[PDB]
Design a binder for this molecule. Structure first.
Ligand SMILES: Nc1ncnc2c1ncn2[C@@H]1O[C@H](COP(=O)(O)OP(=O)(O)OP(=O)(O)O)[C@@H](O)[C@H]1O
Ligand SMILES: Nc1ncnc2c1ncn2[C@@H]1O[C@H](COP(=O)(O)OP(=O)(O)O)[C@@H](O)[C@H]1O
Ligand SMILES: [Mg+2]
Lengths: 935, 893
């Protein structure tokens, strides 16, 4: 009804609308001669005719009232000549309704790719919301960028050629857009935005091909599935690289890659090189000498296939060779806030700035105000009196031209909403800037993010920077207070805090989860050390290193300060080993090694000074190089983090391709539904229940699991049938059906399908693949059990990864052997025996387990050793339940957690392994050795 | 205008003056913001009759249920606990002498503090006397235990152990001679042996509670001493000993408040002497020791506490236990659709005024607006707390205050605030910088079971606990979980308590048997030769098998055999009750069995129901429609009446057919009078006992589905108090003859809090067989005529054989012939059973029900024999021929 009773007007923005807007703006702005010629084209109409008829009306008004005086001074003939000239002029304009139109059409055709690039850049900027909730950019923001480029360009000075002006304005537009967007953007996404801008400019430029197939493979090369057993073995490279080559071989220019890499001899020194992106070899097949951009794309595909940890570096290189080597150089520099706040900030737009939790940005603006000699008032937003103080401060400063601090405004989204509503309808002073500081939270209003000049402040990484920040935050007098060993204890605590806080960055290897080891924990640890040192010293100037309460500090920092948030026993054990290694009397010796096996050969010797200034000097003299061996992590942790960032960037830019490119979803849904119904299995068979098989624990677990799994399979098959019925159009949908269809289209995992344990943030394609693997395993075990009975079920090898609750599987086998040997469950203990042999003889108490993986170590003859491999594929693992005898704990025994997946969020059971060499169990815990049921 | 404005100002000023007087009273005694002002005003108005005030004393104090009155209720005699434990003032204070409520209440509180401090000094003196001796007299031990209240006894034991080990440490002093440590450990071991021998005999319930508390404390003390001896600690300032909670008693202090100081790790706490009645003592596992250390450090740093983790791990219970060990009154704030924003401000003002610990149980369940509001409130009061933490502010003159209800409120540093969270989420972002966090990921159920089972009096506890804890974990893993199942730590504690009670009953039975025959009675001799595994298994069976689905009983028994090998349970035989039940079943036209027969499942189910109604005073029945729960209830009542000679009276009440207000009584807003509800009126009737119903037994069924909206009145009946709280304020008790019941189809909409207060019996739908219902229908056909109406229903009170009524009407003969001819079609594999089984596969317009189909069939066969009767009435010449009856009944069937 409301549709029918009103008429609709759409002042909406789109490709064609913004294209015409940018074309009109650029023609009105930059080109003067055809600017005047095209304004004269708008003057082809009757503006002069209206002026002449107004003059004629005035003359007619001055015509009737006459008594013989119209022959006054022969001045009317001048107006007659003027009107005849105007009539001839508009007649000539009418006659020239084709030549001038053709000229302005050619001139506008000279400026078509520029406006296409403008439209593409603005649409990417609008599509930036889906990457992260913080990225909210507006049409007014893009027009501010465009006006700043077109009008206030310092490059355009002294240039008169129109082609040179076009090239300068295009380069400046791209650079200024990237700078302004990336200033308010996290560091992990600068490369993503630069890659999008490089793609936009590559599409908009002439003389270069599309590389559409190359881009499609670069984005969704992992979406295609390879047949099992179809990957051959190639020397000089690993299994995963072999399937990467197999996936890459589908391209027409990459057919002979296997032959080339087999015939290549110098491949090892490049594959093991530190920077393969500098000396990437020649492997792409071509018929003509390719462009630098084309060879950059080909080598980028090669790097992504071969060494994914260098994907970030090679994407940086491609952006450099596509848009300029100095394109990203602005971001690798300190912020020039002065120019931004003085020029590019509108008086009614508040300077919005954001930070990660635990980090502030008020000091930057305090320094800016100090160097700009402008008075600014600090107001803390935490209560109603704070609200009133903010109100009075802003209504004073809007007239007085001052600056207003509004600290931690993320706690009041309603106040932020009404404050933005106030800011929409005021007239500000020429020097009034409102600085809003808050942490990155999703509760900040989206329209407030849209209507603000956003900024992102992050703490730089590196242990040197972390300890410098810690020593700057800690006042000098607190460390300077007696006794003199307090400085050494504070240095130890700061090193430990930096070690754990930057061990967070390498999750899940550094910790099982990302705890919040922020500034409050640091303050609590400092207060604990202060109190215990005061109690021990009792005002003495010097105390012995042995009399320090090492046990008190270790236990308190392990259980109360840092161990309070630690919900994992193994992370608690790692914290315990850190504290035992660091907080001890041996630390005060001159020969104490603060980090052993750094870079494999050297050690970070602990500074011998007894002063805060000496410790700060040692921190400032720390080498800028840093490896995970500084933290205790293995040296492959940086490569793992880099390839995680690479796949994250690939996924983020794939979100851009499926949303910004819409020239639909039903057509792809047909193929996806048919393919899923293809590779998903047909049906499963239940196991027959007998009075003798009722005592089988795996039969009981099979009954429960296969009841709920037959429910899940019938739901999945029926929902896929419903999806393809909607695809063919003869079936409608309910709310549940349309939400499921939308989730399947967007790739979000169906919640009703997902009620068993799966890794977080995982894709429906991988869910279909590993769920079909689980169903295949279930079909195999059902067929074997039905064919043979329950006697061979003890000897059947079961993979822990394919089981739904392998914890229940462990309980099932322990109660099975307990029932077999008529023993209490407490009188049973687990012993692990990794066997490299295939199908070894199994005892009555031995079981078969496959699919296990070992992280950060290697297993040889049931004895572990430190290894530099990321993950080792364990062979058939044996689970033996021996009686729990009164056996003492060996000095070379280690308990390893067995997490189900790589996220290490769930725990199943623990194993007991020996040590081959005399490697420290503390070193094993520091490296973070764990067992994974599936990779 | 002026006349109305004068009244507008005057009435508001009078209300403000009354509020100012109330606030002056709350300033004279800080405990006063806790009670609502609308109730405090009527408290003031009824200061002479404090019978109504007795209900508000539960909110006034921690565990003081009521205050003892004189014969003329003008001088207070003392205070009673929730069960009735009393403490005596040295010089009782007269309410007549000081009529001001604030004055006499603060006199009561101060004199309570000083008198419990004095008796605590006497307690620690006599416990020092006990502990200085190598052997202790059990009679003197029990005399002291009954002489002094439970919390004071536990605290005296803690102080004595702490001073013993402290003197041991100061006596070695670096000498390295472990003789005093070994003597302290031997003393604790000897006392443990003596008290374990003592708890085996029959004791009063309060004595039993004290003995459980002292074993729970003493096992922890012994374990701490053993760990310290293993660690070889030679100095009293080592952190291995400093991490344990030391109790420092100073009798030389003139002020009683600063007499007791409790220090763990670094903080120097002070005991706030308050009466707690009888509480629950938690076992000091290493997890709770770590929790105590972390919360003590947090309170020393004047931050907050927030133990996050899964529910049912002991977060709010650990906070409550720490508050009990510190003596502070503890409030637990429910955070599930019971939010009262106006009250919480006054509660926070009272906390700032006196000092009390408030724990927000499951803070993750609130919605955004109240989360933000109470987050702002706790933020401002936490910053007020932290205004005391900074050293740059002086402490000799420190009026630490908070802006509470727009008023400057005095704040004392004694209070504490805790906010329990349940991830799976995190704290609100405006509180993370002020509140510490704890990982309550896993309790030490093995040690909990070991200590509780040892306090029950068991000779061996370690193997039984290390079996029963993985037994419950395995049961939770392998059992198909439903809504009413519970295998948590509370279930473990209840199972172990039931096991201890069963063991004590076995001791009493064997002692009585050996006294009846000729031997020598020796309690320890009876004690050592009993299977504790069999006792525990029997307890598990008797408290869990009734609560279990018929699918899950052999799985539970198989798990029992897997965890406890080589031992099986033989069910006790109840011949007298079985025979009386069979006679009542035959009288009331049912089917009986003796196990694994037709009706055997029903018979063992109702025997289990008798076991549950003997163990507990409140139980439920959670069968589906078609499970026989009410009929089993009635049969048990009528059998028990005939067996015991005690009249059984039933009160069947539909809870949701009538309104909750009409069930629990309706209060009168004006011209105050009490209109009795249904259940409350029945309970008042039996309490009055005009017709002598206290000698007889009464059972009350709430025949209908249970909701949390109407069982909140029955929680105070189903708890251990058995005290029905009413808005009238008068206290109604539950005499032991009353056994409240519940008749529910399912508990899909019932709270686990109401679940935990009752036992349950699951009458599976495969209990009443089709043969069973056919037997009932045929018996009713052969016995009950269809034409006598309700006039002869009262005539049934003659002899049950009904002699001379065989030839009462030909209708009885006709329907007896009908039952005889329909007998062959009502067999186990008969036509009716087969047709019902086949129509189970079909679908109908409504949900098919076995008793619905059977009842319709029985009603139409009743009409068929009525049609035969009408045909005979219209044909007086010739009767109904036999073959014609055959054809008609077969065709009608
Ligand atoms: N022992 C028995 N032998 C034969 N029939 C029985 C027996 N016990 C009960 N019945 C029959 O089962 C019917 C239903 O049992 P009951 O009256 O106890 O109700 P219920 O099935 O528990 O119903 P609700 O869910 O309404 O409480 C009774 O009306 C009676 O005819
Ligand atoms: N140390 C302990 N000793 C005995 N029982 C305990 C102990 N810790 C927890 N429990 C039991 O565990 C249950 C936990 O309940 P509660 O703490 O109220 O809820 P939540 O754990 O969700 O905070 C309680 O019923 C309590 O009886
Ligand atoms: Mg019933």
């Amino acid at each position: 009804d409301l549709c029918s009773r009103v008429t609709f007007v759409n002042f909406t923005v789109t490709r064609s609308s913004l294209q015409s807007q940018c074309l009109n703006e650029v023609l009105k702005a930059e080109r003067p001669d055809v600017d005047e010629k095209r304004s004269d084209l708008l003057k082809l109409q009757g503006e002069f005719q209206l002026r002449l008829r107004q003059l004629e009306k005035s003359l007619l008004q001055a015509l009737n009232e006459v008594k013989g005086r119209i022959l006054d001074d022969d001045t009317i003939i001048t107006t007659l000549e003027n009107l005849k000239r105007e009539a001839a002029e508009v007649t000539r304009k009418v006659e020239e309704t084709d030549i001038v139109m053709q000229e302005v059409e050619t001139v506008s055709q000279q400026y078509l790719p520029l406006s296409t690039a403008c439209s593409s850049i603005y649409f990417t900027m609008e599509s930036l919301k889906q990457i992260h909730f913080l990225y909210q950019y507006s049409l007014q923001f893009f027009l501010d960028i465009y006006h700043n480029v077109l009008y206030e360009n310092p490059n355009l000075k002294g240039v008169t050629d129109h082609t040179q002006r076009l090239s300068i304005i295009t380069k400046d537009l791209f650079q200024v857009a990237f700078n302004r967007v990336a200033r308010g953007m996290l560091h992990q996404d600068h490369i993503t935005f630069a890659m999008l801008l490089a793609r936009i400019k590559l599409k908009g430029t002439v003389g270069e091909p599309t590389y559409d197939a190359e881009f499609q493979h670069f984005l969704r090369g992992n979406e295609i599935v390879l047949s099992a057993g179809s990957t051959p073995r190639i020397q000089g490279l690993t299994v995963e690289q072999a399937e990467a080559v197999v996936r890459l071989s589908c391209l027409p220019a990459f057919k002979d890659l296997i032959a080339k890499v087999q015939a290549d001899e110098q491949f090892g020194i490049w594959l093991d090189s530190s920077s393969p992106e500098q000396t990437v070899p020649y492997l792409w097949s071509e018929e003509t000498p390719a462009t630098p951009i084309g060879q950059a794309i080909h080598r980028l595909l090669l790097i992504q296939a071969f060494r994914p940890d260098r994907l970030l570096a090679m994407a940086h290189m491609f952006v450099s060779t596509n848009l300029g080597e100095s394109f990203m150089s602005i971001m690798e520099q300190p912020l020039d806030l002065t120019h931004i706040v003085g020029t590019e900030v509108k008086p009614n737009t508040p300077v919005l700035m954001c930070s990660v939790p635990g980090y502030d940005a008020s000091g930057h603006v305090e320094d800016l105000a100090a160097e700009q000699n402008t008075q600014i008032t600090s107001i803390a937003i935490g209560s109603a009196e704070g609200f009133n103080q903010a109100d009075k401060a802003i209504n004073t400063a809007v007239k007085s031209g001052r600056w207003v601090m509004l600290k931690n405004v993320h706690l009041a989204p309603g106040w932020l909403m009404q404050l933005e509503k106030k800011l929409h309808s005021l007239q500000p002073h020429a020097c009034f800037r409102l600085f809003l500081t808050m942490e990155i939270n999703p509760k900040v209003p989206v329209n407030l993010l849209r209507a603000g000049r956003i900024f992102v402040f992050e703490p730089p990484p590196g242990v040197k920077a972390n300890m410098l920040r810690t020593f700057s935050s800690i006042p000098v007098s607190r460390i300077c207070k007696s006794p003199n060993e307090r400085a050494r204890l504070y240095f130890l605590l700061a090193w430990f805090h930096a070690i754990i806080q930057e061990r967070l960055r390498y999750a899940p290897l550094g910790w099982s989860k990302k705890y919040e080891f922020g500034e409050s924990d640091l303050r609590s640890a400092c207060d604990t050390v202060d109190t215990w040192l005061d109690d021990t010293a009792k005002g003495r100037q010097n105390i012995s290193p042995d009399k320090i309460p090492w046990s008190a500090l270790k236990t308190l920092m392990a259980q109360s300060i840092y161990g309070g948030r630690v919900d994992n026993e193994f992370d608690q054990r790692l914290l315990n080993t850190f504290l035992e290694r660091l907080f001890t009397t041996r630390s005060f010796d001159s020969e104490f090694k603060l980090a052993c096996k750094v870079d494999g050969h050297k050690d970070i010797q602990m500074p011998d000074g007894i002063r805060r200034e000496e410790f700060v000097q040692w921190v400032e003299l720390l080498p800028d190089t840093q490896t995970p061996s500084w933290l205790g992590l293995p040296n492959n942790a940086e490569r793992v983090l880099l390839t995680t960032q690479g796949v994250d960037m690939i996924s983020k830019m794939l979100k851009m391709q499926m949303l910004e490119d819409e020239d639909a979803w039903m057509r792809t849904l047909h193929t996806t539904a048919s393919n899923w119904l293809h590779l998903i299995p047909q049906t499963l068979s239940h196991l027959k229940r007998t009075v003798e098989n009722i005592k089988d624990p795996l039969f009981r677990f099979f009954e429960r699991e296969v009841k709920m799994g037959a429910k899940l399979l019938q739901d999945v098959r029926q929902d896929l049938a419903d999806v393809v019925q909607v695809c063919e159009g003869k079936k409608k949908q309910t709310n549940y059906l349309r939400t499921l269809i939308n989730e399947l289209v967007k790739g979000i995992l169906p919640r009703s399908w997902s009620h068993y344990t799966v890794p977080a943030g995982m894709t429906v394609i991988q869910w279909v693949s590993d769920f079909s693997e689980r169903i295949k395993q279930l079909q195999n075990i059902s067929l074997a059990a039905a064919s043979g009975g329950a006697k061979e079920l003890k000897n059947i090898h079961v993979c822990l990864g394919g089981l739904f609750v392998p914890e229940a599987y462990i309980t099932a086998t322990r109660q099975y052997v307990a029932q077999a040997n008529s023993w209490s469950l407490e009188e049973l203990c687990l012993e692990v025996n990794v066997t490299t042999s295939q199908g070894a003889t199994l005892d009555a108490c031995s079981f078969g387990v496959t699919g296990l993986k070992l992280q950060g170590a290697t297993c040889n003859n049931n004895k572990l050793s430190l290894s530099n491999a990321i993950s080792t594929a364990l062979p058939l693992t044996q689970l033996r339940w021996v009686k729990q005898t009164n056996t003492e704990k060996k000095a070379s025994v280690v308990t390893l957690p067995v997490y189900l997946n790589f996220t290490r969020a769930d725990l199943i059971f623990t194993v007991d392994f020996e040590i081959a060499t005399k490697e420290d169990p503390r070193s094993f815990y520091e490296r973070g050795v764990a067992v994974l049921c599936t990779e | 205008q002026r006349s109305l404005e004068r009244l507008a100002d005057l009435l508001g000023k009078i209300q403000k003056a009354l509020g100012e007087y109330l606030e002056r009273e709350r300033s004279s005694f800080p405990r006063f913001y806790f009670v609502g002002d609308e109730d405090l005003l009527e408290i003031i108005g009824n200061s002479k009759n404090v019978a109504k005030l007795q209900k508000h004393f539960k909110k006034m104090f921690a565990g003081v249920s009521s205050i003892i009155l004189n014969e003329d209720n003008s001088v207070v005699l003392g205070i009673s606990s929730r069960e009735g434990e009393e403490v005596m003032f040295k010089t009782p204070v007269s309410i007549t002498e000081h009529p001001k409520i604030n004055e006499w209440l603060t006199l009561v509180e101060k004199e309570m503090r000083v008198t419990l401090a004095k008796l605590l000094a006497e307690s620690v003196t006599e416990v020092e006397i006990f502990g200085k001796a190598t052997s202790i007299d059990p009679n003197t031990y029990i005399t002291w235990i009954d002489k002094y209240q439970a919390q004071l006894v536990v605290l005296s034991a803690q102080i004595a152990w702490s001073e013993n080990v402290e003197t041991a440490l100061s006596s070695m002093g670096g000498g390295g001679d472990a003789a005093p440590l070994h003597s302290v450990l031997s003393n604790v071991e000897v006392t443990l042996n003596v008290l374990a021998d003592s708890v085996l005999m029959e004791q009063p319930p309060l004595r039993r509670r004290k003995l459980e508390h002292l074993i729970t404390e003493l096992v922890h003390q012994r374990d701490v001493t053993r760990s310290l001896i293993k660690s070889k600690i030679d100095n009293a300032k080592s952190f291995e000993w400093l991490s344990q909670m030391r109790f420092y008693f100073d009798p030389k202090q003139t002020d009683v408040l600063q007499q007791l100081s409790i220090q763990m790790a670094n903080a120097k706490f002070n005991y706030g002497f308050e009466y707690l009645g009888v509480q629950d003592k938690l076992v000091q596992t290493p997890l709770t020791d770590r929790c105590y250390l972390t919360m003590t450090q947090a309170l020393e740093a004047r931050l907050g506490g927030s133990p996050f983790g899964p529910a049912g791990t002991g977060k709010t219970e650990s906070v409550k236990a720490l508050g009990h060990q510190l003596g502070r009154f503890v409030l637990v704030f429910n955070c599930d659709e019971t939010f009262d924003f106006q009250a919480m401000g006054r509660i926070f003002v009272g906390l700032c005024q006196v000092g009390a610990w408030g724990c927000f149980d499951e803070f993750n369940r609130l919605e955004e607006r109240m989360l933000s509001a109470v987050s702002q409130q706790v933020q401002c009061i936490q910053e007020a707390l932290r205004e005391h933490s900074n050293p740059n502010y002086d402490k000799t003159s420190a009026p630490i205050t908070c802006e509470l209800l727009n008023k400057q409120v005095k704040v004392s540093p004694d209070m504490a605030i805790f906010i329990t969270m349940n991830p799976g989420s995190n704290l609100p972002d405006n509180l993370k910088k002020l509140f510490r966090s704890l990982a309550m990921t896993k309790p030490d159920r093995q040690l909990i079971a070991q200590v509780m089972l040892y306090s029950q009096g068991f000779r061996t506890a370690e193997v039984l606990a290390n079996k029963i804890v993985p037994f419950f974990k395995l049961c939770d893993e392998q059992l198909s979980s439903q809504s009413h199942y519970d295998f948590g730590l509370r279930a473990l504690k209840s199972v172990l308590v039931s096991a201890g009670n069963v063991k004590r009953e076995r001791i009493q039975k064997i002692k009585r048997e050996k006294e009846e025959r000729g031997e020598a009675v020796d309690e320890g001799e009876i004690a050592e030769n009993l299977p504790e595994q069999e006792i525990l298994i029997q307890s598990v069976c008797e408290t869990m098998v009734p609560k279990l689905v018929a699918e899950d009983i052999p799985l539970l028994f198989s798990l029992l055999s897997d965890v406890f090998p080589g031992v099986q349970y033989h069910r006790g035989e109840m011949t007298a009750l079985r025979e009386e039940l069979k006679k009542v079943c035959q009288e009331m036209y049912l089917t009986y069995g003796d196990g694994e027969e037709v009706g055997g499942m029903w018979v063992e189910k109702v025997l289990q129901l008798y076991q549950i109604t003997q163990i507990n005073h409140g139980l439920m029945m959670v069968g589906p429609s078609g499970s026989g729960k009410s009929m089993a209830w009635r049969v048990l009542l009528k059998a028990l009446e005939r067996l015991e000679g005690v009249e059984g009276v039933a009160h069947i009440i539909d809870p949701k057919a009538i309104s909750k207000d009409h069930l629990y009584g309706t209060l009168d807003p004006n011209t105050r009078e009490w209109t009795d509800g249904l259940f409350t009126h029945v309970l008042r009737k039996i309490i009055d006992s005009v017709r002598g119903e206290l000698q007889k037994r009464q059972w009350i069924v709430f025949d209908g589905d249970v909701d949390p909206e109407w069982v909140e009145n029955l929680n105070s009946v189903l708890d251990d108090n058995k005290l029905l709280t009413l808005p009238n304020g008068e206290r109604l008790s539950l005499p032991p003859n009353v056994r409240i019941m519940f008749e529910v189809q399912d508990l899909k909409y019932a709270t686990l809090a109401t679940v935990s207060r009752c036992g349950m019996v699951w009458f599976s739908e495969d209990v009443l067989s089709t043969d069973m219902i056919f037997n009932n229908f045929l018996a009713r056909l052969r016995s009950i005529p269809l034409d006598e109406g309700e006039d002869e229903a009262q005539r049934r009170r003659k002899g049950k054989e009904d002699e001379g009524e065989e030839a009462a009407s030909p209708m009885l003969q006709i329907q007896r012939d009908a039952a005889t001819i329909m007998q062959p079609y009502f067999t186990s594999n008969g036509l009716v059973t087969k047709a019902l089984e086949h129509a189970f596969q079909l679908e109908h317009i409504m949900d098919l029900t076995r008793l619905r189909c059977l009842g319709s069939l029985f009603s139409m066969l009743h009409q068929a024999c009525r049609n035969v009767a009408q045909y005979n009435a219209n044909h007086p010449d010739f009767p109904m021929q036999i073959e014609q009856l055959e054809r008609y009944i077969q065709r009608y069937l």
